[PDB]
Amino acid sequence: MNIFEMLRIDEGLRLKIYKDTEGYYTIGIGHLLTKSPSLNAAKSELDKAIGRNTNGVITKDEAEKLFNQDVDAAAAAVRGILRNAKLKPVYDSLDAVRRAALINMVFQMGETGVAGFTNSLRMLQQKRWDEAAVNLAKSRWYNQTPNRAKRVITTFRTGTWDAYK
């Protein structure tokens, strides 16, 4: 098991532009294209990504390509996140699994959502730090996609993959 797997399990895999839960323009295994309105916007977005006039269609490879980047990036966010908000040593003290969920939770957060968390994080404390996490996954996925939200916090709160297993 792993973060990849885990996200493929949580995100699902779509090759045709759709709206997510929040009604955004998304694609693949999470690829948020755009928050707008007009598809076009999102389509165009897709186009520069891919670079080939997809017209809302992609391929497994294509998708897999976006994915990896998305992941490496969440993985990167996470660090910076607790980089700030102080509590860096927490980032370091972490283990695989916790940290995987962390990556999950924060993927594919986007500056605005990112910002807040950091706040809610600092303003929390070295020991409290944890609940903002659980807190953020809740809300992001609660109401709408609660199994996911459950799957995460657990994994996060347990350091065990059994949940996704």
PDB file of C-alpha atoms in Angstrom:
ATOM      1  CA  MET A   1       0.000   0.000   0.000  1.00  0.00           C
ATOM      2  CA  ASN A   2       0.940   3.598  -0.468  1.00  0.00           C
ATOM      3  CA  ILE A   3       0.161   7.210  -1.010  1.00  0.00           C
ATOM      4  CA  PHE A   4      -0.236   6.642  -4.703  1.00  0.00           C
ATOM      5  CA  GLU A   5      -2.462   3.700  -4.265  1.00  0.00           C
ATOM      6  CA  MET A   6      -4.140   5.455  -1.518  1.00  0.00           C
ATOM      7  CA  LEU A   7      -4.971   8.379  -3.684  1.00  0.00           C
ATOM      8  CA  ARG A   8      -5.959   6.344  -6.542  1.00  0.00           C
ATOM      9  CA  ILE A   9      -8.246   4.636  -4.120  1.00  0.00           C
ATOM     10  CA  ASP A  10      -9.632   7.898  -2.838  1.00  0.00           C
ATOM     11  CA  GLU A  11      -9.618  10.035  -5.935  1.00  0.00           C
ATOM     12  CA  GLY A  12     -10.776   7.611  -8.533  1.00  0.00           C
ATOM     13  CA  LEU A  13      -9.772   7.760 -12.109  1.00  0.00           C
ATOM     14  CA  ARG A  14     -11.514   9.887 -14.677  1.00  0.00           C
ATOM     15  CA  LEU A  15     -10.658  10.549 -18.285  1.00  0.00           C
ATOM     16  CA  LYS A  16     -13.307  12.996 -19.162  1.00  0.00           C
ATOM     17  CA  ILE A  17     -13.841  16.428 -17.612  1.00  0.00           C
ATOM     18  CA  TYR A  18     -16.172  16.395 -14.759  1.00  0.00           C
ATOM     19  CA  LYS A  19     -17.166  18.433 -11.794  1.00  0.00           C
ATOM     20  CA  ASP A  20     -16.166  17.343  -8.354  1.00  0.00           C
ATOM     21  CA  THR A  21     -18.183  17.513  -5.188  1.00  0.00           C
ATOM     22  CA  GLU A  22     -17.554  21.185  -4.843  1.00  0.00           C
ATOM     23  CA  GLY A  23     -18.460  21.499  -8.571  1.00  0.00           C
ATOM     24  CA  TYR A  24     -15.086  22.265  -9.880  1.00  0.00           C
ATOM     25  CA  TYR A  25     -13.533  21.321 -13.024  1.00  0.00           C
ATOM     26  CA  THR A  26     -11.386  18.322 -12.379  1.00  0.00           C
ATOM     27  CA  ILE A  27      -9.861  15.394 -14.138  1.00  0.00           C
ATOM     28  CA  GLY A  28      -7.879  12.168 -13.708  1.00  0.00           C
ATOM     29  CA  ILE A  29      -7.121  11.142 -10.118  1.00  0.00           C
ATOM     30  CA  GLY A  30      -7.727  14.559  -8.568  1.00  0.00           C
ATOM     31  CA  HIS A  31      -6.485  16.970 -11.164  1.00  0.00           C
ATOM     32  CA  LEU A  32      -8.208  20.090 -10.321  1.00  0.00           C
ATOM     33  CA  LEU A  33      -8.495  21.966 -13.505  1.00  0.00           C
ATOM     34  CA  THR A  34     -10.418  25.056 -12.455  1.00  0.00           C
ATOM     35  CA  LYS A  35     -12.886  26.653 -10.116  1.00  0.00           C
ATOM     36  CA  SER A  36     -14.518  28.756 -12.800  1.00  0.00           C
ATOM     37  CA  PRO A  37     -17.717  28.483 -14.662  1.00  0.00           C
ATOM     38  CA  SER A  38     -16.842  27.940 -18.244  1.00  0.00           C
ATOM     39  CA  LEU A  39     -15.626  24.533 -19.150  1.00  0.00           C
ATOM     40  CA  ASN A  40     -13.592  26.179 -21.871  1.00  0.00           C
ATOM     41  CA  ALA A  41     -11.520  27.678 -19.169  1.00  0.00           C
ATOM     42  CA  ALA A  42     -10.971  24.319 -17.688  1.00  0.00           C
ATOM     43  CA  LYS A  43     -10.491  22.707 -21.102  1.00  0.00           C
ATOM     44  CA  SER A  44      -7.926  25.243 -22.114  1.00  0.00           C
ATOM     45  CA  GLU A  45      -6.236  24.592 -18.789  1.00  0.00           C
ATOM     46  CA  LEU A  46      -6.115  20.972 -19.580  1.00  0.00           C
ATOM     47  CA  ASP A  47      -4.687  21.868 -22.895  1.00  0.00           C
ATOM     48  CA  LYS A  48      -1.615  23.599 -21.664  1.00  0.00           C
ATOM     49  CA  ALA A  49      -1.104  20.856 -19.209  1.00  0.00           C
ATOM     50  CA  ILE A  50      -1.230  18.157 -21.855  1.00  0.00           C
ATOM     51  CA  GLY A  51      -0.403  20.365 -24.727  1.00  0.00           C
ATOM     52  CA  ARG A  52      -2.500  18.757 -27.490  1.00  0.00           C
ATOM     53  CA  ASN A  53      -6.191  19.721 -27.709  1.00  0.00           C
ATOM     54  CA  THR A  54      -7.729  17.113 -25.582  1.00  0.00           C
ATOM     55  CA  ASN A  55     -11.145  18.615 -25.704  1.00  0.00           C
ATOM     56  CA  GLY A  56     -11.759  17.113 -22.295  1.00  0.00           C
ATOM     57  CA  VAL A  57     -10.259  13.752 -22.981  1.00  0.00           C
ATOM     58  CA  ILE A  58      -7.107  12.190 -21.761  1.00  0.00           C
ATOM     59  CA  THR A  59      -5.386   8.886 -21.385  1.00  0.00           C
ATOM     60  CA  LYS A  60      -4.221   6.695 -18.617  1.00  0.00           C
ATOM     61  CA  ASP A  61      -0.720   7.773 -19.344  1.00  0.00           C
ATOM     62  CA  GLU A  62      -1.743  11.324 -19.515  1.00  0.00           C
ATOM     63  CA  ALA A  63      -3.585  11.067 -16.262  1.00  0.00           C
ATOM     64  CA  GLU A  64      -0.789   9.167 -14.649  1.00  0.00           C
ATOM     65  CA  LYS A  65       1.414  11.918 -15.750  1.00  0.00           C
ATOM     66  CA  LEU A  66      -0.606  14.592 -14.041  1.00  0.00           C
ATOM     67  CA  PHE A  67      -0.915  12.452 -10.961  1.00  0.00           C
ATOM     68  CA  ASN A  68       2.726  12.045 -10.127  1.00  0.00           C
ATOM     69  CA  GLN A  69       3.314  15.736 -10.342  1.00  0.00           C
ATOM     70  CA  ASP A  70       0.284  16.376  -8.155  1.00  0.00           C
ATOM     71  CA  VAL A  71       1.617  13.979  -5.613  1.00  0.00           C
ATOM     72  CA  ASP A  72       5.223  15.205  -5.474  1.00  0.00           C
ATOM     73  CA  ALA A  73       3.726  18.492  -4.916  1.00  0.00           C
ATOM     74  CA  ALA A  74       1.390  17.622  -2.062  1.00  0.00           C
ATOM     75  CA  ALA A  75       4.320  15.929  -0.540  1.00  0.00           C
ATOM     76  CA  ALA A  76       6.101  19.283  -0.906  1.00  0.00           C
ATOM     77  CA  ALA A  77       3.282  21.392   0.455  1.00  0.00           C
ATOM     78  CA  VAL A  78       3.085  19.378   3.606  1.00  0.00           C
ATOM     79  CA  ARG A  79       6.641  20.168   4.533  1.00  0.00           C
ATOM     80  CA  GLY A  80       6.384  23.841   3.846  1.00  0.00           C
ATOM     81  CA  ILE A  81       3.185  23.862   5.773  1.00  0.00           C
ATOM     82  CA  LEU A  82       4.676  22.852   9.023  1.00  0.00           C
ATOM     83  CA  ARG A  83       7.816  24.478   7.794  1.00  0.00           C
ATOM     84  CA  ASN A  84       5.834  27.580   8.670  1.00  0.00           C
ATOM     85  CA  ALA A  85       3.407  27.453  11.546  1.00  0.00           C
ATOM     86  CA  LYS A  86       6.624  26.623  13.285  1.00  0.00           C
ATOM     87  CA  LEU A  87       6.397  22.956  14.325  1.00  0.00           C
ATOM     88  CA  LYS A  88       8.899  21.849  11.717  1.00  0.00           C
ATOM     89  CA  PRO A  89      10.356  19.233  14.045  1.00  0.00           C
ATOM     90  CA  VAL A  90       6.940  17.680  13.933  1.00  0.00           C
ATOM     91  CA  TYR A  91       7.324  17.219  10.206  1.00  0.00           C
ATOM     92  CA  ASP A  92      10.545  15.519  10.916  1.00  0.00           C
ATOM     93  CA  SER A  93       9.382  13.310  13.746  1.00  0.00           C
ATOM     94  CA  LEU A  94       6.677  11.913  11.512  1.00  0.00           C
ATOM     95  CA  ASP A  95       6.414   8.424  10.167  1.00  0.00           C
ATOM     96  CA  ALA A  96       5.451   7.166   6.739  1.00  0.00           C
ATOM     97  CA  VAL A  97       1.805   6.608   7.134  1.00  0.00           C
ATOM     98  CA  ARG A  98       0.958   9.668   9.173  1.00  0.00           C
ATOM     99  CA  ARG A  99       2.798  11.687   6.740  1.00  0.00           C
ATOM    100  CA  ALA A 100       1.050   9.903   3.880  1.00  0.00           C
ATOM    101  CA  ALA A 101      -2.345  10.962   5.095  1.00  0.00           C
ATOM    102  CA  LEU A 102      -0.938  14.387   5.576  1.00  0.00           C
ATOM    103  CA  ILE A 103      -0.042  14.405   1.909  1.00  0.00           C
ATOM    104  CA  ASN A 104      -3.483  13.035   1.148  1.00  0.00           C
ATOM    105  CA  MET A 105      -5.337  15.517   3.344  1.00  0.00           C
ATOM    106  CA  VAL A 106      -3.509  18.450   1.737  1.00  0.00           C
ATOM    107  CA  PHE A 107      -3.804  17.163  -1.853  1.00  0.00           C
ATOM    108  CA  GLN A 108      -4.785  19.055  -3.904  1.00  0.00           C
ATOM    109  CA  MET A 109      -5.293  21.944  -1.555  1.00  0.00           C
ATOM    110  CA  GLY A 110      -4.902  25.283  -3.213  1.00  0.00           C
ATOM    111  CA  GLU A 111      -3.701  28.575  -1.750  1.00  0.00           C
ATOM    112  CA  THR A 112      -6.528  29.909   0.118  1.00  0.00           C
ATOM    113  CA  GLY A 113      -7.292  26.556   1.609  1.00  0.00           C
ATOM    114  CA  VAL A 114      -3.601  26.152   2.211  1.00  0.00           C
ATOM    115  CA  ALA A 115      -3.272  29.478   3.941  1.00  0.00           C
ATOM    116  CA  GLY A 116      -5.980  28.854   6.487  1.00  0.00           C
ATOM    117  CA  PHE A 117      -4.739  25.454   7.534  1.00  0.00           C
ATOM    118  CA  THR A 118      -1.392  26.921   8.273  1.00  0.00           C
ATOM    119  CA  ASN A 119      -3.057  29.505  10.447  1.00  0.00           C
ATOM    120  CA  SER A 120      -5.341  27.105  12.188  1.00  0.00           C
ATOM    121  CA  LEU A 121      -2.189  25.090  12.545  1.00  0.00           C
ATOM    122  CA  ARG A 122       0.080  27.623  14.217  1.00  0.00           C
ATOM    123  CA  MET A 123      -2.529  29.107  16.268  1.00  0.00           C
ATOM    124  CA  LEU A 124      -3.171  25.567  17.507  1.00  0.00           C
ATOM    125  CA  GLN A 125       0.107  24.253  19.044  1.00  0.00           C
ATOM    126  CA  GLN A 126       2.801  21.548  18.916  1.00  0.00           C
ATOM    127  CA  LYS A 127       0.254  19.499  20.717  1.00  0.00           C
ATOM    128  CA  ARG A 128      -3.006  20.317  19.246  1.00  0.00           C
ATOM    129  CA  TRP A 129      -1.433  20.405  15.895  1.00  0.00           C
ATOM    130  CA  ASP A 130      -3.003  17.132  15.336  1.00  0.00           C
ATOM    131  CA  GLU A 131      -6.653  18.176  15.486  1.00  0.00           C
ATOM    132  CA  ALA A 132      -6.423  20.829  12.833  1.00  0.00           C
ATOM    133  CA  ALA A 133      -5.438  17.945  10.596  1.00  0.00           C
ATOM    134  CA  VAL A 134      -8.346  15.795  11.492  1.00  0.00           C
ATOM    135  CA  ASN A 135     -10.303  18.959  11.430  1.00  0.00           C
ATOM    136  CA  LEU A 136      -9.448  19.892   7.907  1.00  0.00           C
ATOM    137  CA  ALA A 137     -10.104  16.462   6.403  1.00  0.00           C
ATOM    138  CA  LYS A 138     -13.398  16.678   8.090  1.00  0.00           C
ATOM    139  CA  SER A 139     -15.213  19.372   6.129  1.00  0.00           C
ATOM    140  CA  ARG A 140     -13.195  18.843   3.043  1.00  0.00           C
ATOM    141  CA  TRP A 141     -14.685  15.438   2.750  1.00  0.00           C
ATOM    142  CA  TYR A 142     -17.335  15.034   5.402  1.00  0.00           C
ATOM    143  CA  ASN A 143     -20.823  15.710   4.327  1.00  0.00           C
ATOM    144  CA  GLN A 144     -20.186  14.438   0.812  1.00  0.00           C
ATOM    145  CA  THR A 145     -17.599  11.763   0.885  1.00  0.00           C
ATOM    146  CA  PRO A 146     -17.441  10.539   4.345  1.00  0.00           C
ATOM    147  CA  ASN A 147     -15.899   7.212   3.769  1.00  0.00           C
ATOM    148  CA  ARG A 148     -12.861   8.871   2.449  1.00  0.00           C
ATOM    149  CA  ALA A 149     -12.777  11.242   5.261  1.00  0.00           C
ATOM    150  CA  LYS A 150     -12.993   8.294   7.586  1.00  0.00           C
ATOM    151  CA  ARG A 151     -10.461   6.271   5.741  1.00  0.00           C
ATOM    152  CA  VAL A 152      -7.956   9.042   6.152  1.00  0.00           C
ATOM    153  CA  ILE A 153      -8.211   9.969   9.728  1.00  0.00           C
ATOM    154  CA  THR A 154      -7.510   6.679  11.157  1.00  0.00           C
ATOM    155  CA  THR A 155      -4.834   5.951   8.913  1.00  0.00           C
ATOM    156  CA  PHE A 156      -3.488   9.191  10.103  1.00  0.00           C
ATOM    157  CA  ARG A 157      -4.490   8.468  13.578  1.00  0.00           C
ATOM    158  CA  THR A 158      -3.192   4.918  13.520  1.00  0.00           C
ATOM    159  CA  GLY A 159      -0.176   4.597  11.185  1.00  0.00           C
ATOM    160  CA  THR A 160      -1.852   1.595   9.646  1.00  0.00           C
ATOM    161  CA  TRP A 161      -2.980   1.052   6.163  1.00  0.00           C
ATOM    162  CA  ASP A 162      -5.820  -1.393   7.348  1.00  0.00           C
ATOM    163  CA  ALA A 163      -8.777   0.841   6.438  1.00  0.00           C
ATOM    164  CA  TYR A 164      -7.743   0.986   2.801  1.00  0.00           C
ATOM    165  CA  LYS A 165      -7.057  -2.681   3.125  1.00  0.00           C
TER     166      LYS A 165
END
